[PDB]
């Protein structure tokens, strides 16, 4: 019922479908300027039987994924602050280390180093939310 009525916020004249114009005028309306060429790429990623616009089928689909990949994200960013303890957007050697100890493993320093340099992309000595993310896969 909410998808349907997010649809008819872009299908401005009522016709039951979203066409390339119909989308510039939702994405202005939200501070975006987006070049047509860019509002064809739009429409052609969710536009899947390539007739040119999006249907409320073709809509819901796509957002019914994005719901699925956003609450996704929620949840691996809710696990992130759980491990960064102090919230500076890296988990350290000792954040984990104590991170651990409450999930029932009791790791030394030599451990938790392994597990951070397994995930350390960037060689700073500390897990950042890409790198958290990738281990997480
Ligand atoms: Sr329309
Ligand atoms: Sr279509
Ligand atoms: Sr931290
Ligand atoms: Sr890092």
């Known amino acids: 019922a909410e998808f349907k009525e997010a649809f008819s916020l872009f299908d401005k004249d009522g016709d039951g479908t979203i066409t390339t114009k119909e989308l510039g005028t939702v994405m202005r309306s ?19 039987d390539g007739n040119g616009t999006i249907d409320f089928p073709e809509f819901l689909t796509m957002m019914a994924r994005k719901m699925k990949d956003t609450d996704s994200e929620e949840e691996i960013r809710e696990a992130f602050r759980v491990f960064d303890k102090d919230g500076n957007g890296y988990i350290s050697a000792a954040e984990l280390r104590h991170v651990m100890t409450n999930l029932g493993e009791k790791l030394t320093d030599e451990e938790v180093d392994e597990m951070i340099r397994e995930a350390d992309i960037d060689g700073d000595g500390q897990v950042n939310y890409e790198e958290f993310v990738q281990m997480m896969t």
């Open 30 to 48: 939200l501070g975006q300027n987006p070049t047509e060429a860019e509002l064809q790429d739009m429409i052609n990623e969710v536009d899947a």
